Amino acid sequence: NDSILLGLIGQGLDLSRTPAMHEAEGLAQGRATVYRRIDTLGSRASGQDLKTLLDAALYLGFNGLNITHPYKQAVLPLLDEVSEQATQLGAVNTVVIDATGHTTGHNTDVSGFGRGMEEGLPNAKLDSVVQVGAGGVGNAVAYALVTHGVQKLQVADLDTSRAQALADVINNAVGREAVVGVDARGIEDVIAAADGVVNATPMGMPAHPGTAFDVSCLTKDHWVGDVVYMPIETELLKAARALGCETLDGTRMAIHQAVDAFRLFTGLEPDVSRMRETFLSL
Amino acid sequence: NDSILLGLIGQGLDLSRTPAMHEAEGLAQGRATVYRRIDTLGSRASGQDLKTLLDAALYLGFNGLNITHPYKQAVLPLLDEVSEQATQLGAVNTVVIDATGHTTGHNTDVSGFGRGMEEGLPNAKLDSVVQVGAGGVGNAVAYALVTHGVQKLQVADLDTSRAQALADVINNAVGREAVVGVDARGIEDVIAAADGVVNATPMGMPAHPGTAFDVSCLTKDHWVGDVVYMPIETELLKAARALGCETLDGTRMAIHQAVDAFRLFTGLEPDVSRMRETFLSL
Ligand SMILES: NC(=O)c1ccc[n+]([C@@H]2O[C@H](COP(=O)([O-])OP(=O)(O)OC[C@H]3O[C@@H](n4cnc5c(N)ncnc54)[C@H](O)[C@@H]3O)[C@@H](O)[C@H]2O)c1
Ligand SMILES: NC(=O)c1ccc[n+]([C@@H]2O[C@H](COP(=O)([O-])OP(=O)(O)OC[C@H]3O[C@@H](n4cnc5c(N)ncnc54)[C@H](O)[C@@H]3O)[C@@H](O)[C@H]2O)c1
Ligand SMILES: O=C(O)C1=C[C@@H](O)[C@@H](O)[C@H](O)C1
Ligand SMILES: O=C(O)C1=C[C@@H](O)[C@@H](O)[C@H](O)C1
């Protein structure tokens, strides 16, 4: 019945649904659970170095942390151990803290997106996929794609250098040329020839209305995924659904990263439907 | 329904009943509550300076802390504000942390012992009392005694200097010569002439069996108190009860310090009977 203490280190955390998911699921399994935002833009933690905040969590009896932007790369050298996937990606979003203070980094963005593919695109054809966007979440998405059956992934970003760096990282991680950086300009023709496409840009959010490419390149035979989870039905996914395409909405990864982290943090088997419920309720 | 995060900074905390009391009462009032030991003898926090640990709690989203030995004096200069009672005593056991990180020190050992007198000795004659022991908890007990109606308190300690320092601190706090240091040797004759006596030494604990003075000096008309709370019925209180004396057991202060701190930490009205229940159940 031991209480569970967790937090999230990052910037601009007020709207995160991750604390609620973990607090509700802990309680549902008979464990009082606190999950605190540790926001370096906020009044409590501003100006503090990542190492200070990590060490604080160790001293205070935290059982785990999530890590978000801008710290998912910076955190790695601070940890005692890092999983092979998080090591090869160079990004950790989950830190398990042992009873006595030892830290292990994991990446449940990767495992969560992969689980979302299994759950929401079980029959998808994976030979050729395009991903638009190579930022933060895009790196984990790309790794997930090519580890969950994608043979060739073409990644486009306005910043070609980001796409090519992504490709190098993932290809090294997997040990094959799974990923190719391609130009953003003319990406429609590349998507048209592919089996599926994933949006890993901010486009579709209320503050970034529209789509990252012209949806007229889609066909009924494509599948389409999106990382954006608010709104759940982005303009891109609306356009795909209108053609009869299978779609993967961004809530799947957002929920499953938390499912997977909860399991790592606690050793308990999370109830996916309960955590999904909490996510959707906020 | 916001979750509550609390801890205790001190040494040798495994057997504290304070975390359980606060966790259970938070939950009973519909708030998931974590209360962590922050033990500088343990694996998480050893070697860290008090200031490091206090700052950690601020950064991490703690709502409050208790402070125990050896830090109840050292903590004062680290806090933004300290209550008048804790300031004059020179000892803080409770730190309220505001939403945005500001700290206020309080002393609920003082308020808790006083409440115990009201609750368990409502009819006690208070003109002349003896206290044996001037350590850590003894300072708070002495302040409580003379602020809850004791006219003259005689404090004995094997270390006369500790008793006289206590007397100076309390007398300054109250603004009268309420307390006098007296020799431990011959304390029985002093107790015999007094209305009541309080044990503030370790005597009566399993590892300190016996009594701090010869109980043959007690009469049926005395009242007797004890700070020791395990066992609840110390040899001293057994001897008092055998004569028909009213007695004050150490659980009252131990419970009420937590009642009072919970109120300060949360702004909720604690249920005393529930917290007492939790205490006794451990
Ligand atoms: N599902 C989830 O769990 C989850 C979690 C966090 C964030 N997100 C979403 O992921 C989005 C991306 O997050 P991020 O932190 O990687 O953002 P980021 O800004 O670091 O990366 C976005 C990338 O998209 C590129 N881009 C923008 N428009 C483009 C276009 N038209 N064509 C090609 N590239 C384009 C940018 O150059 C940038 O490199 C966020 O806006 C958020 O909506 C989802
Ligand atoms: N009720 C409660 O909430 C509560 C909380 C914490 C501790 N305690 C109890 O309080 C006891 C005292 O705690 P402390 O931290 O102040 O201990 P301490 O060791 O700092 O102080 C005890 C004092 O008793 C004196 N002493 C010992 N035997 C004596 C004797 N025969 N005559 C005169 N003086 C004597 C010592 O010289 C010392 O100064 C603990 O052992 C514990 O059982 C009670
Ligand atoms: O702040 C959020 O909502 C989160 C964002 C992602 O970085 C996740 O990986 C993190 O665990 C939770
Ligand atoms: O560790 C304990 O059991 C405690 C001891 C006293 O110092 C109290 O004042 C503190 O709040 C809790």
XYZ file of C-alpha atoms in Angstrom, chain B residues 30-248:
219
model
C -10.207 13.158 -0.389
C -6.612 14.195 -1.067
C -3.984 11.688 -2.163
C -1.117 12.447 0.228
C 2.523 11.434 0.174
C 4.590 12.002 3.269
C 8.243 11.043 2.818
C 10.957 10.547 5.361
C 14.015 12.635 4.352
C 16.545 10.855 6.544
C 20.107 12.141 6.490
C 21.264 8.805 7.851
C 19.631 6.947 4.943
C 20.536 6.102 1.406
C 18.652 8.961 -0.292
C 19.634 12.100 1.698
C 22.881 11.255 3.600
C 25.651 13.905 3.454
C 23.335 16.615 2.258
C 23.188 19.910 4.037
C 19.892 21.020 5.538
C 19.677 23.925 3.100
C 20.069 21.549 0.116
C 17.193 19.411 1.350
C 14.937 22.366 2.165
C 15.606 23.897 -1.260
C 14.938 20.480 -2.884
C 11.477 20.413 -1.258
C 10.735 23.856 -2.615
C 11.756 22.968 -6.161
C 9.871 19.640 -6.135
C 6.473 20.923 -5.099
C 6.301 20.002 -1.439
C 3.524 21.703 0.473
C 5.150 21.358 3.838
C 7.802 19.724 5.937
C 8.304 18.629 9.468
C 11.771 19.060 10.942
C 13.216 16.941 13.690
C 16.533 16.328 15.399
C 19.188 17.576 14.781
C 17.697 20.359 12.661
C 14.995 22.184 14.612
C 17.266 25.071 15.566
C 19.428 25.099 12.423
C 16.416 25.461 10.178
C 15.276 28.887 11.455
C 17.701 31.129 9.548
C 16.890 29.257 6.347
C 13.198 30.144 6.406
C 11.455 33.217 5.025
C 9.253 33.687 8.116
C 9.027 32.092 11.541
C 6.081 32.295 13.957
C 6.585 34.281 17.097
C 6.505 31.202 19.316
C 8.995 29.259 17.195
C 11.192 32.358 16.965
C 11.282 32.869 20.721
C 11.831 29.198 21.425
C 14.471 29.030 18.725
C 13.037 25.773 17.380
C 10.835 24.949 14.358
C 9.276 21.539 13.732
C 6.835 22.547 10.957
C 7.486 24.418 7.719
C 4.542 25.532 5.597
C 5.537 25.990 1.935
C 3.268 28.382 0.021
C 2.142 27.559 -3.561
C 4.992 29.634 -4.912
C 7.767 28.380 -2.550
C 7.837 30.745 0.474
C 8.539 29.081 3.838
C 7.014 29.739 7.262
C 8.241 27.984 10.361
C 5.973 26.968 13.247
C 6.253 24.835 16.332
C 3.526 22.276 16.807
C 5.439 20.437 19.526
C 4.487 23.449 21.695
C 0.896 23.647 20.514
C 0.530 19.854 20.572
C 1.729 19.428 24.137
C -0.548 22.288 25.215
C -3.488 20.681 23.492
C -2.646 17.411 25.270
C -2.867 19.229 28.612
C -6.270 20.630 27.680
C -7.494 17.274 26.419
C -6.028 14.950 29.058
C -5.472 17.140 32.149
C -8.342 19.638 31.986
C -8.672 19.927 35.791
C -4.955 19.779 36.729
C -3.561 22.196 39.313
C -0.759 24.144 37.642
C 0.747 26.440 40.280
C 3.996 24.468 40.654
C 5.313 21.904 38.259
C 8.603 20.084 37.879
C 9.998 18.977 34.530
C 12.839 16.436 34.424
C 14.821 16.767 31.205
C 15.762 19.816 29.149
C 16.716 18.345 25.802
C 15.065 18.714 22.448
C 11.468 17.911 23.226
C 11.810 19.311 26.750
C 12.223 22.850 25.484
C 8.867 22.717 23.667
C 7.191 21.021 26.622
C 8.425 23.683 29.022
C 7.182 26.506 26.752
C 3.811 24.762 26.424
C 3.515 24.268 30.173
C 4.103 27.907 31.068
C 1.886 29.214 28.254
C -0.993 26.898 29.229
C -1.220 28.051 32.868
C 1.851 26.823 34.807
C 2.911 29.570 37.194
C 6.264 28.177 38.278
C 8.142 25.485 36.405
C 11.295 23.966 37.881
C 13.375 22.230 35.232
C 16.086 19.721 36.172
C 18.604 18.157 33.828
C 21.774 16.206 34.553
C 23.403 18.962 32.482
C 22.599 21.989 34.632
C 23.700 24.279 31.782
C 20.952 22.874 29.524
C 18.331 23.489 32.162
C 19.486 27.040 32.778
C 19.640 27.827 29.042
C 16.099 26.477 28.719
C 14.948 28.676 31.585
C 16.489 31.765 29.989
C 14.887 31.068 26.609
C 11.435 30.442 27.967
C 11.471 33.306 30.453
C 12.433 35.663 27.633
C 9.693 34.172 25.414
C 6.946 34.727 27.992
C 8.267 37.895 29.656
C 8.331 36.641 33.242
C 10.400 34.373 35.435
C 8.273 31.338 34.761
C 11.073 28.780 34.764
C 13.892 28.046 37.166
C 16.704 25.541 36.591
C 17.105 23.278 39.647
C 19.603 20.572 40.424
C 18.783 17.034 39.336
C 20.298 15.790 42.584
C 17.572 15.846 45.242
C 14.829 16.465 42.684
C 12.467 14.157 44.619
C 12.024 16.711 47.402
C 11.214 19.373 44.817
C 8.650 17.119 43.099
C 7.088 16.165 46.452
C 6.245 19.829 47.076
C 4.927 20.469 43.554
C 1.493 19.915 41.985
C 2.750 17.895 39.037
C 5.755 16.475 37.301
C 6.608 15.750 33.675
C 9.242 13.325 32.408
C 11.037 14.782 29.395
C 13.904 12.264 29.446
C 14.273 8.988 27.568
C 13.640 7.017 30.776
C 10.805 4.563 30.402
C 11.683 3.547 26.829
C 12.659 -0.135 26.296
C 16.280 0.902 25.832
C 16.156 3.225 28.929
C 14.189 1.170 31.435
C 13.169 2.706 34.745
C 12.285 6.220 35.887
C 14.150 9.565 36.004
C 13.520 9.915 39.738
C 12.336 7.809 42.653
C 8.580 7.443 42.346
C 8.177 7.147 46.109
C 8.085 10.969 46.148
C 4.721 10.925 44.344
C 1.407 11.294 46.142
C -2.167 10.656 45.147
C -2.641 14.379 44.725
C 0.054 14.819 42.053
C -0.540 14.682 38.350
C 2.141 13.112 36.211
C 3.041 13.479 32.545
C 5.465 11.699 30.278
C 6.858 12.475 26.841
C 7.681 8.853 26.117
C 5.014 7.339 23.916
C 6.300 3.815 23.536
C 5.415 2.257 25.813
C 2.305 4.329 26.395
C 2.219 3.283 30.023
C 5.727 3.886 31.231
C 6.898 2.711 34.641
C 6.478 6.299 35.827
C 2.863 6.517 34.675
C 2.126 3.065 36.147
C 3.385 4.251 39.506
C 1.330 7.437 39.294
C -1.827 5.575 38.281
C -1.353 3.151 41.179
C -1.737 6.112 43.575
C -4.838 7.473 41.779
C -3.000 10.303 40.017
C -4.210 11.786 36.803
C -1.712 11.071 34.064
C -0.777 12.522 30.698
